[PDB]
Amino acid sequence: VLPENMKRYMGRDAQRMNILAGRIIAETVRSTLGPKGMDKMLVDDLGDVVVTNDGVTILREMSVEHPAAKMLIEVAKTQEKEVGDGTTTAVVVAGELLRKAEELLDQNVHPTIVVKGYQAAAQKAQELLKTIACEVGAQDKEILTKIAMTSITGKGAEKAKEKLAEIIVEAVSAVVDDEGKVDKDLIKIEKKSGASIDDTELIKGVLVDKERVSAQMPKKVTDAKIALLNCAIEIKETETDAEIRITDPAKLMEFIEQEEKMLKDMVAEIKASGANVLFCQKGIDDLAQHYLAKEGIVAARRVKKSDMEKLAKATGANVIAAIAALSAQDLGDAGLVEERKISGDSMIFVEECKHPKAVTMLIRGTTEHVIEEVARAVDDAVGVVGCTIEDGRIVSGGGSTEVELSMKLREYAEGISGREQLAVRAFADALEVIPRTLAENAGLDAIEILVKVRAAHASNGNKCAGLNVFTGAVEDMCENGVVEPLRVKTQAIQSAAESTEMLLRIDDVIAAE
């Protein structure tokens, strides 16, 4: 079936190989875990290098070979989509679970029991998390800024986590509407080198990095009537083949003047709708740009389809395919639409809209790769703040959850018994790697923190413990504002355990020629 040279894994080898794939990924990713986690340097085929700590960015960009690692990536991706955070967490515990899996396989625990114990412990872990979760005001200013900041930590951007929490909490509360469901597409992350991270600021509307196509156009329009076109404002040609046949030099001019009228009529139609701002996804004819300026219409051409959509969301402007199809009902409203140059580049600010459904975050900083790292940092901050509003429960950080999971799943193991209790016992053991490696990356003693934090959690409770890697000692994570959304950690374990078992489900690898 396999071509001479193609490698095949089966039984203990298929399981070891899949464990090796997930473990090697987890071995790489686990070093990014925690506030004191490190960075990875990813260099592509062209020489372009990106530095990050985000599990998803790392796994997507790197050139993975093992299919087992390719399935684990789906966890990191659905983590970013569903909750934003929990990337590193889910991958690390997944690789750890796989390490434990082979121990059990060798210790005479059948693979069908191992996958049973993991599914069982994860199902109990869902109940455990739902019952350990600490209820909090979904829109509480304080918890929102605490969730935001704690997500930001372990990244370079944390130097301004206070300004960023304020920005992201405001943005999410705006676009989330009710309490709630958030759409991350309504919050744009824009970045422009120059200034510092303290200068990063939220714009209640849409910021695009475009210019006014004519110098004759106003540089600022208030009470703006935004029209969105996706076609070019040029002389259209019909579908049916057609050519003009000039018989007179006056007739050559008869057409020239007709194209002048045409482009004027195109602008007159925009004007007729009541529009005075015009964003065209395609180009705008040089003559039409003059006509646009003549009618006091401010305009930008070649607008990114994504930018056209954000504008539609914020202003309520309607992207129209055909210019003829424009109507007054297609116009959006903005308080102010103004052309501004920041760090030399022209960008148009569409702000102060009536009821903006989309906002833009303008990130500043001393270097492109810094504001790039910041852009990733705040992307997660939006996610996790949205998670806290969508589900009004949060949990203590510093490994307090994973410690609760160890304590209670080890008790759960006892109820299960048989070889199935070793599978559950090993599941809990794997989940302990997070508390362990959170501090491992901080340079703290895995042994001391393991005993003292475990005892402190078990005795003092859940919202009255956890390990603080910042002081290098057990603290009160809840009092210190070190909390994350319930969704993050519940989805992290769920998906991580499921993909891990999935890897453990395969007993044979068949490669096509």
Added chain:
Amino acid sequence: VLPENMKRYMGRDAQRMNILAGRIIAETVRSTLGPKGMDKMLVDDLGDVVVTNDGVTILREMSVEHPAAKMLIEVAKTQEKEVGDGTTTAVVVAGELLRKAEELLDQNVHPTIVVKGYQAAAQKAQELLKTIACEVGAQDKEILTKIAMTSITGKGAEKAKEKLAEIIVEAVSAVVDDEGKVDKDLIKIEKKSGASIDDTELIKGVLVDKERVSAQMPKKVTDAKIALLNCAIEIKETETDAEIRITDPAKLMEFIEQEEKMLKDMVAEIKASGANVLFCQKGIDDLAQHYLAKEGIVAARRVKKSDMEKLAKATGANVIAAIAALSAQDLGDAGLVEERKISGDSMIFVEECKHPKAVTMLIRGTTEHVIEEVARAVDDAVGVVGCTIEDGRIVSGGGSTEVELSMKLREYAEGISGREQLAVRAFADALEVIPRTLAENAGLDAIEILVKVRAAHASNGNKCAGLNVFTGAVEDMCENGVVEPLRVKTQAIQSAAESTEMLLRIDDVIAAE
């Protein structure tokens, strides 16, 4: 993940390798440091060679392999963009910091403490620089020419640093407007081989290396009405397909005469606006060139888009896409627009404008590579003079700052304590390399100047010390006019320390296939 043959670095190897990358760059760049710094010979793939001392030019042109060096380059670039100078400085201290970093890593100082100490010492260094900074008149003729000259030194151009300081101080004061914000794009650096560096001179307006498209056109126009076109002055064709069908030899002529009228009408439209100078980004039809000359319009074709923009800035002329779109409001004013031949080549001088927002500096010299080196030298001079106006504080040179930083960050280290004080102590040690290598390149004793200058600075103060490599002994840098803008040195350390830590942030390099 990595293809067989691809190299991977992790832990101590990833850190050593990144230190080696930055150190090798710093080892190369540190030889350019100071008034007695040397030059680098950069030879490309085609054989074209450039000689320079500018850190940015060196790093951009050279073919860098290490991603760590690729991130350090961003410091050199943002240095040139933000402050102009501090290229060498930032790179050198960055590589030195990296050397110290591994010492600390081996000495049992955890990488998370090293990056903490550097960030901490740099944050204190910002306060130290803000408090050591010496207040000066932002527009003071003297400090402006002193900043200009001290930036110029260590370059071949310093032979005429007096004439260059006068030129650059005037140019910046003009375009900077208030006190202030300077746009370096408003000051053009033009160069033409011939004459000497003493012949370099400032033109209050825009100089372009173009000619008058017709010999029939005036060679000098006063009280000029400048029109800017970006399209060609030719017979346009419509978007819709069209062809002329001639049925008579008189009708062939009917069209020929219509194209004559057309191009005449195009010129008549320029004339109708009141224009008498015409810069076309595209070509001009031979017949239209005659019509332009007939109406007394001086014109140049194929003008660089950059040149069109500088003309718009200076004269207030408005670049118009379509000839039909021309209006009187699109005209700029210039006192004199005149065609002059210097060193054989034709160039048009647009000078003595009403309120020029852009100026041009015409550099002369005995060789192209000399006036090339001068062009780079004065580019920095513009930057740093702008820095002094933007922030009305300057600092003493001759390593006096870096010595203040050593003295006070070593005291700062004491307050920090733990292993964190070694990180801060090493940070200060790294910053000392500048005082050390400034004189290293001069051929002065690193040991003697280190003791005597340190004591002299600590005892006598900040604006009453520093090392003068020109006499090879401690002097009074402030009295001798050896000062640089606060912005240069503050941005230099900030970005250098941040990119250094960034390099220290990576613990693992992943290369894609």
Added chain:
Amino acid sequence: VLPENMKRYMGRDAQRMNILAGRIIAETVRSTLGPKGMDKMLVDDLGDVVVTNDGVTILREMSVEHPAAKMLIEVAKTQEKEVGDGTTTAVVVAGELLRKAEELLDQNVHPTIVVKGYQAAAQKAQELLKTIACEVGAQDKEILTKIAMTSITGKGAEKAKEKLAEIIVEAVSAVVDDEGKVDKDLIKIEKKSGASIDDTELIKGVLVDKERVSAQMPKKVTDAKIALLNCAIEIKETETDAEIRITDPAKLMEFIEQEEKMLKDMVAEIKASGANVLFCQKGIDDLAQHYLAKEGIVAARRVKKSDMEKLAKATGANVIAAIAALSAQDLGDAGLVEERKISGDSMIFVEECKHPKAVTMLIRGTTEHVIEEVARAVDDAVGVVGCTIEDGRIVSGGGSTEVELSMKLREYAEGISGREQLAVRAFADALEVIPRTLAENAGLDAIEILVKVRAAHASNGNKCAGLNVFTGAVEDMCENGVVEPLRVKTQAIQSAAESTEMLLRIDDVIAAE
């Protein structure tokens, strides 16, 4: 230091590599563990293949590469020398300890603590074994035959372990003298294909596979006077160079007859001492063989030096270098010395001696490789029976010891605390592999037997438990006669733990060119 191509291991790699070496050996050897342990097929460079279960035989014959495995072999060898048994046991727990060692190294337990915990737990294990040991009559017929048989089990020879126990217990009791110290060199293991294993029998004296050099000699001599010569019974030549110069054919005969007299005198000297049995390590002249037969002296030539020594031990015969050096005091006594042909081959039985200090065990069986396997099986049986007499304490088998060690060293770990308790806890975990793999090879469930046997041992005691792989369930090892000498298991753990730590002591491998 190392030649290009030579591999070098250090830190985590030196430790992993050494663990891999010991673990791979242990992974191979652990399959031989227990009554249901399997065999290994060792094929040399010449094609000669040996099948065995004995750890020493396996490790000596196989071509080991890793120096770590080369040090572990010393444990298996000193096991065979000191106690006979405990080969597999010591190697298995050694490799297991090494596996645990890296777990602890990764879990932030410093290698100096790991080696401390193992040394500490092994020192406590010595006390634990000395206190768990069950006192037994050193010469008790029953325990002696039980020790013998339990050692024999897991080998092919166990089919006749009853006859073999009787043979070995008698042999050891004879040569051990007091209670006691046994010399395994006093018990010879002879083997000859033919008959069955039931026909194996003990000869109270020495059996050699030699013949009577002359057909004229008696085939049986009673009340035998044994003389041992190591030189040949031939015409000696002097050290100083000398040659005979014959001047007459009568004189040629004068010498010929002198050599006849010489060899006669050599025999006459043997006769003069009172000897009537003669074993010559070297050859015997054909004429001298006749003279020996003439005097009624039975003789064998080219006797193995080992055979000459066993004869000296049993009979009290004294090996004499020079024939002239023979005296009456050099003679040994034997009840009967008789030439017998078994399976076609001639062998001389020297039996029924006055006070034999050496005995011979004649092994029979249907194939050479069977009686070869039996020879190895009974070699151990001699050792372990000697161990029980040398130290009058025995211990229950079926992993009962190792379970006691797990239970009490896990309690010991608690007293130790710190990271040192994990080292002791892991030491105990490693010692559990024996109970686990004893039944692993039987095809029993590692999980069920681990829980039920642990509880059964902890509750019921030490001499009232253990796992019986023969019924596949916990039993009473003591009641069922499944016991081994204290010496075996105490030496096994001691040496195994020491060599394991030794492997853990190395942090760097230096290979000479």
